[PDB]
Amino acid sequence: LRCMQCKTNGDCRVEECALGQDLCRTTIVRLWEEGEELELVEKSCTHSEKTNRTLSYRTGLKITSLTEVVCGLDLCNQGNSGVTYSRSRYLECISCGSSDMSCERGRHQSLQCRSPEEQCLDVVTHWIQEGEEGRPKDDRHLRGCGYLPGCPGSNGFHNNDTFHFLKCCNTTKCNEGPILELENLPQNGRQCYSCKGNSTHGCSSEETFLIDCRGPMNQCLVATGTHEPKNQSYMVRGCATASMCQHAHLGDAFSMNHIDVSCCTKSGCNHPD
Amino acid sequence: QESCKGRCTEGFNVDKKCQCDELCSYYQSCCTDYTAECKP
Amino acid sequence: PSNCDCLNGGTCVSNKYFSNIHWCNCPKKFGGQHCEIDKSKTCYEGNGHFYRGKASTDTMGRPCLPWNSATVLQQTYHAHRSDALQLGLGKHNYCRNPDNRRRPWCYVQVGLKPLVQECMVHDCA
Numbered sequence A: 001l002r003c004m005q006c007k008t009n010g011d012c013r014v015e016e017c018a019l020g021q022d023l024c025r026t027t028i029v030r031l032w033e034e035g036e037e038l039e040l041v042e043k044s045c046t047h048s049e050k051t052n053r054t055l056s057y058r059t060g061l062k063i064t065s066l067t068e069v070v071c072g073l074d075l076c077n078q079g080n081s082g083v084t085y086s087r088s089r090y091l092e093c094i095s096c097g098s099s100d101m102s103c104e105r106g107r108h109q110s111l112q113c114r115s116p117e118e119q120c121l122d123v124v125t126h127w128i129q130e131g132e133e134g135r136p137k138d139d140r141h142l143r144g145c146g147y148l149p150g151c152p153g154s155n156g157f158h159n160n161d162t163f164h165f166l167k168c169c170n171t172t173k174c175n176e177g178p179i180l181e182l183e184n185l186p187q188n189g190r191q192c193y194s195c196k197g198n199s200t201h202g203c204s205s206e207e208t209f210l211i212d213c214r215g216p217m218n219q220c221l222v223a224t225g226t227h228e229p230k231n232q233s234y235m236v237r238g239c240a241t242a243s244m245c246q247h248a249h250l251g252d253a254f255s256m257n258h259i260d261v262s263c264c265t266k267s268g269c270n271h272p273d
Numbered sequence B: 001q002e003s004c005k006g007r008c009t010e011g012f013n014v015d016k017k018c019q020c021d022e023l024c025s026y027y028q029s030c031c032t033d034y035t036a037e038c039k040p
Numbered sequence C: 001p002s003n004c005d006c007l008n009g010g011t012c013v014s015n016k017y018f019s020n021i022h023w024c025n026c027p028k029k030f031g032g033q034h035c036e037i038d039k040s041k042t043c044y045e046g047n048g049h050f051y052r053g054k055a056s057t058d059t060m061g062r063p064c065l066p067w068n069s070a071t072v073l074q075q076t077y078h079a080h081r082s083d084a085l086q087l088g089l090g091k092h093n094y095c096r097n098p099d100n101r102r103r104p105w106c107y108v109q110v111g112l113k114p115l116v117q118e119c120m121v122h123d124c125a
Ligand SMILES: *[C@H]1O[C@H](CO)[C@@H](O[C@@H]2O[C@H](CO)[C@@H](O[C@H]3O[C@H](CO)[C@@H](O)[C@H](O)[C@@H]3O)[C@H](O)[C@H]2NC(C)=O)[C@H](O)[C@H]1NC(C)=O
Pocket: A198, A199, A200, A201, A233
Protein backbone atom coordinates (compact mmCIF):
# COMPACT_ATOMS: atom_id res chain seq x y z
CA LEU A 1 0.00 0.00 0.00
CA ARG A 2 1.31 3.39 -1.14
CA CYS A 3 -0.58 6.65 -0.69
CA MET A 4 -0.59 10.31 -1.42
CA GLN A 5 0.77 12.37 1.44
CA CYS A 6 -0.53 15.93 1.24
CA LYS A 7 -0.29 18.81 3.72
CA THR A 8 -2.93 21.50 3.61
CA ASN A 9 -0.28 23.84 2.18
CA GLY A 10 -0.55 21.47 -0.79
CA ASP A 11 3.02 20.05 -0.74
CA CYS A 12 2.70 16.35 -1.78
CA ARG A 13 4.71 13.18 -2.14
CA VAL A 14 4.25 9.40 -2.05
CA GLU A 15 4.57 7.27 1.10
CA GLU A 16 5.02 3.46 1.04
CA CYS A 17 1.86 3.51 2.90
CA ALA A 18 3.41 3.16 6.39
CA LEU A 19 3.81 -0.25 8.02
CA GLY A 20 0.96 -2.48 9.35
CA GLN A 21 -1.66 0.22 8.53
CA ASP A 22 -3.43 0.20 5.15
CA LEU A 23 -5.90 2.74 3.97
CA CYS A 24 -5.20 6.02 2.28
CA ARG A 25 -7.53 8.80 3.12
CA THR A 26 -8.51 12.28 2.14
CA THR A 27 -9.91 14.78 4.54
CA ILE A 28 -11.46 18.04 3.53
CA VAL A 29 -12.43 21.03 5.56
CA ARG A 30 -14.49 23.72 3.86
CA LEU A 31 -14.67 26.97 5.75
CA TRP A 32 -17.57 28.98 4.33
CA GLU A 33 -18.54 32.52 5.35
CA GLU A 34 -21.27 34.55 3.55
CA GLY A 35 -19.96 34.77 -0.02
CA GLU A 36 -16.45 33.61 0.51
CA GLU A 37 -14.87 30.23 1.21
CA LEU A 38 -11.66 28.19 1.53
CA GLU A 39 -10.80 24.52 1.29
CA LEU A 40 -8.23 22.50 3.09
CA VAL A 41 -7.36 19.07 1.85
CA GLU A 42 -5.16 16.49 3.56
CA LYS A 43 -4.09 13.12 2.24
CA SER A 44 -2.13 10.28 3.80
CA CYS A 45 -1.92 6.69 5.04
CA THR A 46 -4.08 5.63 7.98
CA HIS A 47 -5.31 2.64 9.98
CA SER A 48 -7.91 0.13 8.85
CA GLU A 49 -10.88 0.83 11.16
CA LYS A 50 -11.25 4.38 9.65
CA THR A 51 -14.18 5.01 7.30
CA ASN A 52 -16.28 7.48 5.23
CA ARG A 53 -17.90 10.29 7.34
CA THR A 54 -19.18 13.96 7.32
CA LEU A 55 -20.23 16.42 10.07
CA SER A 56 -21.17 20.02 9.03
CA TYR A 57 -22.19 22.90 11.26
CA ARG A 58 -23.00 26.55 11.61
CA THR A 59 -21.26 28.92 13.95
CA GLY A 60 -22.88 32.33 13.54
CA LEU A 61 -22.47 33.69 10.02
CA LYS A 62 -20.31 30.71 9.01
CA ILE A 63 -20.58 27.06 8.17
CA THR A 64 -17.80 24.44 8.50
CA SER A 65 -17.92 21.10 6.63
CA LEU A 66 -15.73 18.23 7.49
CA THR A 67 -15.49 15.27 5.32
CA GLU A 68 -13.09 12.37 5.02
CA VAL A 69 -13.02 9.65 2.41
CA VAL A 70 -11.40 6.30 2.59
CA CYS A 71 -10.11 3.76 0.06
CA GLY A 72 -7.45 0.95 0.05
CA LEU A 73 -5.35 0.76 -3.17
CA ASP A 74 -1.69 1.64 -3.93
CA LEU A 75 -2.57 5.27 -4.72
CA CYS A 76 -6.31 6.10 -4.74
CA ASN A 77 -6.51 9.37 -2.75
CA GLN A 78 -5.01 10.72 -5.98
CA GLY A 79 -7.29 13.22 -7.80
CA ASN A 80 -10.12 15.67 -7.00
CA SER A 81 -13.03 15.73 -4.46
CA GLY A 82 -16.69 14.48 -4.76
CA VAL A 83 -22.47 19.93 -12.92
CA THR A 84 -24.11 19.64 -9.41
CA TYR A 85 -23.68 17.22 -6.43
CA SER A 86 -25.99 19.52 -4.42
CA ARG A 87 -28.95 19.45 -6.76
CA SER A 88 -31.02 19.87 -3.59
CA ARG A 89 -31.18 20.35 0.16
CA TYR A 90 -32.32 17.47 2.35
CA LEU A 91 -32.85 16.99 6.10
CA GLU A 92 -33.15 20.04 8.37
CA CYS A 93 -31.35 20.11 11.71
CA ILE A 94 -30.36 22.45 14.40
CA SER A 95 -26.79 23.42 14.47
CA CYS A 96 -24.27 25.43 16.44
CA GLY A 97 -20.86 24.92 18.10
CA SER A 98 -18.53 25.86 20.96
CA SER A 99 -16.04 27.97 18.95
CA ASP A 100 -18.38 31.00 19.17
CA MET A 101 -20.60 29.60 21.93
CA SER A 102 -23.59 29.59 19.56
CA CYS A 103 -24.26 26.25 21.20
CA GLU A 104 -23.74 27.38 24.80
CA ARG A 105 -25.82 30.54 24.52
CA GLY A 106 -28.74 28.79 22.80
CA ARG A 107 -28.08 30.65 19.54
CA HIS A 108 -28.95 27.48 17.59
CA GLN A 109 -29.64 27.66 13.83
CA SER A 110 -31.41 25.65 11.09
CA LEU A 111 -29.05 23.83 8.73
CA GLN A 112 -30.09 21.64 5.84
CA CYS A 113 -28.00 18.70 4.79
CA ARG A 114 -26.34 18.41 1.44
CA SER A 115 -26.88 14.70 0.94
CA PRO A 116 -29.65 12.08 1.39
CA GLU A 117 -27.61 9.98 3.79
CA GLU A 118 -26.67 12.67 6.30
CA GLN A 119 -28.53 12.74 9.65
CA CYS A 120 -28.63 15.24 12.48
CA LEU A 121 -25.85 14.92 15.05
CA ASP A 122 -25.02 16.24 18.51
CA VAL A 123 -21.45 15.43 19.52
CA VAL A 124 -19.97 16.19 22.97
CA THR A 125 -16.23 16.21 23.62
CA HIS A 126 -15.15 17.06 27.14
CA TRP A 127 -11.71 16.83 28.82
CA ILE A 128 -10.80 17.51 32.46
CA GLN A 129 -7.68 19.46 31.30
CA GLU A 130 -4.01 18.53 30.44
CA GLY A 131 -2.03 15.54 28.99
CA GLU A 132 0.48 16.80 26.41
CA GLU A 133 0.17 20.45 27.64
CA GLY A 134 -3.45 21.46 26.82
CA ARG A 135 -4.94 18.41 24.98
CA PRO A 136 -7.15 18.06 21.83
CA LYS A 137 -8.78 21.18 20.41
CA ASP A 138 -12.15 19.66 19.63
CA ASP A 139 -15.08 21.99 19.99
CA ARG A 140 -16.82 20.81 23.06
CA HIS A 141 -20.32 20.91 21.55
CA LEU A 142 -20.97 20.69 17.87
CA ARG A 143 -24.27 19.97 16.22
CA GLY A 144 -25.43 19.81 12.65
CA CYS A 145 -25.53 17.52 9.61
CA GLY A 146 -23.45 14.48 9.19
CA TYR A 147 -22.87 10.82 9.03
CA LEU A 148 -20.39 9.70 11.64
CA PRO A 149 -19.11 6.22 12.30
CA GLY A 150 -21.50 3.93 14.16
CA CYS A 151 -24.26 6.39 14.11
CA PRO A 152 -27.91 5.49 13.96
CA GLY A 153 -28.98 6.16 17.52
CA SER A 154 -26.37 6.90 20.10
CA ASN A 155 -23.20 6.24 22.01
CA GLY A 156 -21.26 7.66 24.95
CA PHE A 157 -18.45 7.11 27.40
CA HIS A 158 -17.45 9.00 30.51
CA ASN A 159 -15.00 8.48 33.30
CA ASN A 160 -13.16 10.51 35.95
CA ASP A 161 -11.97 13.07 33.42
CA THR A 162 -13.68 12.66 30.07
CA PHE A 163 -17.00 12.56 28.38
CA HIS A 164 -17.81 11.95 24.74
CA PHE A 165 -21.22 11.56 23.19
CA LEU A 166 -22.87 11.10 19.76
CA LYS A 167 -26.53 11.42 19.16
CA CYS A 168 -27.26 10.66 15.59
CA CYS A 169 -30.81 10.43 14.30
CA ASN A 170 -32.70 10.38 10.94
CA THR A 171 -35.86 12.39 11.76
CA THR A 172 -36.54 16.14 11.11
CA LYS A 173 -34.72 18.32 13.69
CA CYS A 174 -34.36 15.26 15.91
CA ASN A 175 -31.11 16.89 17.16
CA GLU A 176 -32.68 19.93 18.82
CA GLY A 177 -33.13 20.77 22.51
CA PRO A 178 -30.74 21.86 25.25
CA ILE A 179 -27.06 20.85 25.00
CA LEU A 180 -26.18 17.84 27.30
CA GLU A 181 -23.78 18.58 30.14
CA LEU A 182 -23.32 15.15 31.79
CA GLU A 183 -23.31 16.61 35.34
CA ASN A 184 -26.85 16.99 34.35
CA LEU A 185 -27.94 13.53 33.32
CA PRO A 186 -29.26 11.18 36.07
CA GLN A 187 -27.11 8.67 37.88
CA ASN A 188 -28.28 5.39 36.41
CA GLY A 189 -27.37 3.28 39.41
CA ARG A 190 -24.20 1.59 38.19
CA GLN A 191 -20.78 2.22 39.66
CA CYS A 192 -17.73 1.54 37.56
CA TYR A 193 -14.03 1.94 37.86
CA SER A 194 -12.20 4.74 36.07
CA CYS A 195 -8.64 5.50 34.78
CA LYS A 196 -6.61 6.44 31.74
CA GLY A 197 -2.93 5.68 31.06
CA ASN A 198 -0.82 2.53 31.38
CA SER A 199 -1.72 -0.66 33.23
CA THR A 200 1.12 0.23 35.60
CA HIS A 201 0.89 3.83 36.80
CA GLY A 202 -2.17 5.30 35.10
CA CYS A 203 -4.44 2.30 35.49
CA SER A 204 -3.13 0.61 38.65
CA SER A 205 -5.37 -0.65 41.50
CA GLU A 206 -4.32 2.25 43.69
CA GLU A 207 -5.25 4.76 40.94
CA THR A 208 -8.56 3.20 39.86
CA PHE A 209 -11.61 4.07 41.90
CA LEU A 210 -15.35 4.06 41.30
CA ILE A 211 -17.58 6.73 39.74
CA ASP A 212 -21.36 6.80 39.32
CA CYS A 213 -22.36 6.25 35.77
CA ARG A 214 -24.91 8.56 34.28
CA GLY A 215 -27.42 8.62 31.48
CA PRO A 216 -27.65 5.61 29.18
CA MET A 217 -23.99 4.89 29.80
CA ASN A 218 -24.57 2.05 32.16
CA GLN A 219 -22.06 -0.64 31.24
CA CYS A 220 -18.65 -0.66 32.82
CA LEU A 221 -16.05 -0.81 30.13
CA VAL A 222 -12.38 -1.60 29.79
CA ALA A 223 -10.55 -0.61 26.64
CA THR A 224 -6.98 -1.43 25.72
CA GLY A 225 -5.31 -0.19 22.47
CA THR A 226 -2.28 1.70 21.05
CA HIS A 227 -1.95 5.51 21.21
CA GLU A 228 -0.69 8.21 18.81
CA PRO A 229 2.76 9.42 18.45
CA LYS A 230 2.83 5.57 18.45
CA ASN A 231 3.17 5.07 22.21
CA GLN A 232 1.69 1.61 22.76
CA SER A 233 -0.40 0.15 25.55
CA TYR A 234 -2.87 2.95 26.45
CA MET A 235 -5.72 1.66 28.61
CA VAL A 236 -9.05 3.32 29.56
CA ARG A 237 -11.86 2.37 32.05
CA GLY A 238 -15.30 3.90 32.59
CA CYS A 239 -19.05 4.12 32.07
CA ALA A 240 -20.34 3.48 28.55
CA THR A 241 -23.29 2.58 26.39
CA ALA A 242 -23.57 -0.92 24.91
CA SER A 243 -23.08 0.91 21.59
CA MET A 244 -19.58 1.81 22.79
CA CYS A 245 -18.88 -1.82 23.70
CA GLN A 246 -19.58 -2.53 20.06
CA HIS A 247 -16.98 -1.58 17.47
CA ALA A 248 -13.97 0.72 17.77
CA HIS A 249 -16.00 3.81 18.57
CA LEU A 250 -13.55 4.43 21.34
CA GLY A 251 -10.79 4.47 18.72
CA ASP A 252 -11.52 7.99 17.48
CA ALA A 253 -12.38 9.25 20.99
CA PHE A 254 -8.99 8.27 22.38
CA SER A 255 -6.77 8.54 19.32
CA MET A 256 -6.25 4.71 19.61
CA ASN A 257 -5.74 1.76 17.09
CA HIS A 258 -6.17 -2.02 17.08
CA ILE A 259 -8.38 -2.04 20.11
CA ASP A 260 -10.09 -4.59 22.38
CA VAL A 261 -12.99 -3.54 24.52
CA SER A 262 -14.34 -5.82 27.17
CA CYS A 263 -17.52 -4.62 28.88
CA CYS A 264 -19.92 -5.76 31.65
CA THR A 265 -23.15 -5.04 33.59
CA LYS A 266 -22.81 -5.57 37.38
CA SER A 267 -21.42 -2.54 39.23
CA GLY A 268 -17.66 -2.54 39.84
CA CYS A 269 -17.17 -5.56 37.47
CA ASN A 270 -14.59 -3.29 35.93
CA HIS A 271 -11.54 -3.60 38.16
CA PRO A 272 -8.13 -4.65 36.98
CA ASP A 273 -9.13 -7.39 39.42
CA GLN B 1 -37.05 29.70 -15.55
CA GLU B 2 -34.01 30.61 -13.44
CA SER B 3 -32.79 34.21 -12.90
CA CYS B 4 -32.48 35.84 -9.50
CA LYS B 5 -33.80 39.27 -10.50
CA GLY B 6 -37.07 37.60 -9.61
CA ARG B 7 -37.57 39.01 -6.11
CA CYS B 8 -34.06 37.94 -5.06
CA THR B 9 -34.92 37.57 -1.36
CA GLU B 10 -37.76 35.17 -0.78
CA GLY B 11 -35.66 32.28 0.54
CA PHE B 12 -35.16 28.63 -0.47
CA ASN B 13 -37.59 27.55 -3.20
CA VAL B 14 -37.67 23.73 -3.24
CA ASP B 15 -39.45 23.68 -6.65
CA LYS B 16 -37.13 26.17 -8.38
CA LYS B 17 -33.82 25.89 -10.35
CA CYS B 18 -31.22 28.41 -9.06
CA GLN B 19 -31.68 29.86 -5.61
CA CYS B 20 -31.34 33.42 -4.38
CA ASP B 21 -31.07 32.97 -0.65
CA GLU B 22 -28.26 33.65 1.79
CA LEU B 23 -26.86 30.10 1.69
CA CYS B 24 -27.07 29.42 -2.05
CA SER B 25 -23.27 29.50 -2.42
CA TYR B 26 -23.04 27.07 0.50
CA TYR B 27 -25.46 24.74 -1.15
CA GLN B 28 -23.79 25.63 -4.41
CA SER B 29 -27.12 26.65 -5.91
CA CYS B 30 -27.05 30.37 -6.72
CA CYS B 31 -28.18 32.10 -9.87
CA THR B 32 -25.30 33.43 -11.84
CA ASP B 33 -26.79 36.89 -11.36
CA TYR B 34 -27.24 36.56 -7.57
CA THR B 35 -23.93 38.32 -6.88
CA ALA B 36 -24.90 40.98 -9.37
CA GLU B 37 -28.65 41.37 -8.77
CA CYS B 38 -28.77 41.33 -4.96
CA LYS B 39 -25.17 41.57 -3.71
CA PRO B 40 -23.44 44.29 -5.77
CA PRO C 1 1.44 29.10 25.28
CA SER C 2 -0.40 29.31 21.92
CA ASN C 3 -0.88 26.59 19.28
CA CYS C 4 -1.00 26.01 15.51
CA ASP C 5 0.36 28.64 13.30
CA CYS C 6 -2.78 30.77 13.61
CA LEU C 7 -2.03 34.42 13.12
CA ASN C 8 -3.91 37.56 14.15
CA GLY C 9 -5.54 36.03 17.25
CA GLY C 10 -6.84 33.09 15.34
CA THR C 11 -8.04 30.28 17.55
CA CYS C 12 -6.96 26.80 16.64
CA VAL C 13 -9.49 23.96 16.09
CA SER C 14 -9.37 20.24 15.42
CA ASN C 15 -11.74 17.29 15.19
CA LYS C 16 -11.34 13.79 16.59
CA TYR C 17 -13.60 12.28 13.91
CA PHE C 18 -11.38 13.49 11.07
CA SER C 19 -7.74 12.48 11.43
CA ASN C 20 -7.26 15.48 13.75
CA ILE C 21 -6.86 17.82 10.86
CA HIS C 22 -6.41 21.20 12.45
CA TRP C 23 -7.30 24.61 11.15
CA CYS C 24 -7.66 28.16 12.27
CA ASN C 25 -10.65 29.98 13.50
CA CYS C 26 -10.26 33.51 12.26
CA PRO C 27 -11.77 36.85 13.14
CA LYS C 28 -13.44 39.29 10.87
CA LYS C 29 -11.13 40.72 8.17
CA PHE C 30 -8.73 37.75 8.23
CA GLY C 31 -9.02 34.51 6.46
CA GLY C 32 -6.64 32.12 4.85
CA GLN C 33 -5.50 28.88 6.33
CA HIS C 34 -3.90 30.83 9.22
CA CYS C 35 -5.85 34.10 9.32
CA GLU C 36 -2.87 35.01 7.15
CA ILE C 37 -4.84 37.24 4.85
CA ASP C 38 -6.02 40.72 5.59
CA LYS C 39 -9.19 40.54 3.54
CA SER C 40 -9.89 44.15 4.67
CA LYS C 41 -6.84 45.92 3.05
CA THR C 42 -6.61 47.72 -0.32
CA CYS C 43 -3.28 49.51 -0.19
CA TYR C 44 0.23 48.88 1.07
CA GLU C 45 2.34 50.61 3.63
CA GLY C 46 5.76 51.72 2.39
CA ASN C 47 7.79 49.06 0.55
CA GLY C 48 5.09 46.39 0.78
CA HIS C 49 7.09 43.66 2.55
CA PHE C 50 4.51 43.50 5.33
CA TYR C 51 1.47 43.83 2.99
CA ARG C 52 -0.90 40.87 3.16
CA GLY C 53 -4.50 40.98 1.88
CA LYS C 54 -5.71 40.30 -1.64
CA ALA C 55 -4.90 41.71 -5.07
CA SER C 56 -3.76 39.40 -7.75
CA THR C 57 -2.84 41.38 -10.84
CA ASP C 58 0.15 43.36 -12.19
CA THR C 59 0.18 46.74 -14.02
CA MET C 60 -0.98 45.37 -17.37
CA GLY C 61 -3.91 43.62 -15.68
CA ARG C 62 -2.14 40.30 -16.10
CA PRO C 63 -3.12 37.86 -13.29
CA CYS C 64 -0.49 36.58 -10.90
CA LEU C 65 0.77 32.98 -11.00
CA PRO C 66 -0.06 31.09 -7.74
CA TRP C 67 2.83 30.91 -5.26
CA ASN C 68 2.36 27.08 -5.13
CA SER C 69 2.06 26.44 -8.87
CA ALA C 70 4.74 24.25 -10.60
CA THR C 71 6.23 27.19 -12.52
CA VAL C 72 6.44 29.44 -9.49
CA LEU C 73 7.75 26.44 -7.58
CA GLN C 74 10.87 26.87 -9.73
CA GLN C 75 11.58 30.48 -8.66
CA THR C 76 13.24 31.88 -5.58
CA TYR C 77 9.88 32.75 -3.98
CA HIS C 78 7.17 30.16 -3.49
CA ALA C 79 4.75 28.75 -0.93
CA HIS C 80 6.70 25.57 -0.17
CA ARG C 81 9.48 27.44 1.55
CA SER C 82 9.63 27.27 5.37
CA ASP C 83 9.50 31.05 5.92
CA ALA C 84 6.59 31.00 3.37
CA LEU C 85 3.99 32.10 5.94
CA GLN C 86 6.20 34.86 7.29
CA LEU C 87 6.62 36.06 3.72
CA GLY C 88 2.92 35.91 2.90
CA LEU C 89 3.49 33.30 0.23
CA GLY C 90 0.86 30.61 0.13
CA LYS C 91 -1.74 28.75 -1.89
CA HIS C 92 -3.09 31.84 -3.64
CA ASN C 93 -1.85 34.38 -6.14
CA TYR C 94 -2.07 37.47 -3.96
CA CYS C 95 0.65 40.12 -4.48
CA ARG C 96 3.66 40.19 -2.19
CA ASN C 97 7.12 41.71 -1.80
CA PRO C 98 9.14 39.19 0.16
CA ASP C 99 12.33 40.51 -1.44
CA ASN C 100 11.97 44.22 -0.78
CA ARG C 101 11.38 45.63 -4.29
CA ARG C 102 10.05 49.21 -4.32
CA ARG C 103 6.59 47.73 -4.14
CA PRO C 104 4.33 44.64 -4.02
CA TRP C 105 4.80 42.36 -7.04
CA CYS C 106 4.36 38.80 -8.30
CA TYR C 107 5.31 36.16 -10.92
CA VAL C 108 3.42 36.53 -14.21
CA GLN C 109 3.28 34.37 -17.26
CA VAL C 110 4.68 36.55 -20.03
CA GLY C 111 6.70 34.55 -22.47
CA LEU C 112 7.80 31.09 -21.30
CA LYS C 113 9.98 31.57 -18.18
CA PRO C 114 7.54 33.83 -16.20
CA LEU C 115 8.52 37.35 -15.16
CA VAL C 116 8.34 39.23 -11.90
CA GLN C 117 5.99 42.20 -12.27
CA GLU C 118 5.23 45.18 -10.01
CA CYS C 119 1.63 44.68 -8.97
CA MET C 120 -1.84 46.32 -9.18
CA VAL C 121 -1.87 48.01 -5.80
CA HIS C 122 -2.03 51.39 -4.22
CA ASP C 123 0.27 52.99 -1.70
CA CYS C 124 -1.79 54.33 1.19
CA ALA C 125 -0.15 57.73 0.57
C1 LIG D 1 3.70 4.42 30.68
O1 LIG D 1 3.41 5.70 30.13
C2 LIG D 1 4.11 6.81 30.62
C3 LIG D 1 3.64 7.98 29.76
O2 LIG D 1 4.37 9.15 30.05
C4 LIG D 1 5.65 6.61 30.59
O3 LIG D 1 6.26 7.77 31.19
C5 LIG D 1 7.43 8.40 30.55
O4 LIG D 1 7.31 8.65 29.16
C6 LIG D 1 8.40 9.36 28.55
C7 LIG D 1 8.07 9.49 27.06
O5 LIG D 1 8.75 10.58 26.47
C8 LIG D 1 9.82 8.73 28.76
O6 LIG D 1 10.93 9.60 28.40
C9 LIG D 1 11.49 9.44 27.04
O7 LIG D 1 11.22 10.56 26.16
C10 LIG D 1 12.24 11.38 25.58
C11 LIG D 1 11.81 11.96 24.22
O8 LIG D 1 10.84 12.95 24.44
C12 LIG D 1 13.58 10.68 25.38
O9 LIG D 1 14.56 11.59 24.92
C13 LIG D 1 14.00 10.07 26.71
O10 LIG D 1 15.27 9.49 26.55
C14 LIG D 1 12.98 9.00 27.10
O11 LIG D 1 13.18 7.90 26.24
C15 LIG D 1 9.99 8.17 30.19
O12 LIG D 1 10.98 7.17 30.16
C16 LIG D 1 8.71 7.60 30.85
N1 LIG D 1 8.94 7.41 32.29
C17 LIG D 1 8.00 7.29 33.22
C18 LIG D 1 7.59 8.57 33.90
O13 LIG D 1 7.50 6.22 33.55
C19 LIG D 1 6.01 5.25 31.25
O14 LIG D 1 7.41 4.99 31.24
C20 LIG D 1 5.19 4.09 30.62
N2 LIG D 1 5.39 2.74 31.17
C21 LIG D 1 4.70 1.66 30.72
C22 LIG D 1 3.54 1.13 31.51
O15 LIG D 1 4.96 1.08 29.67
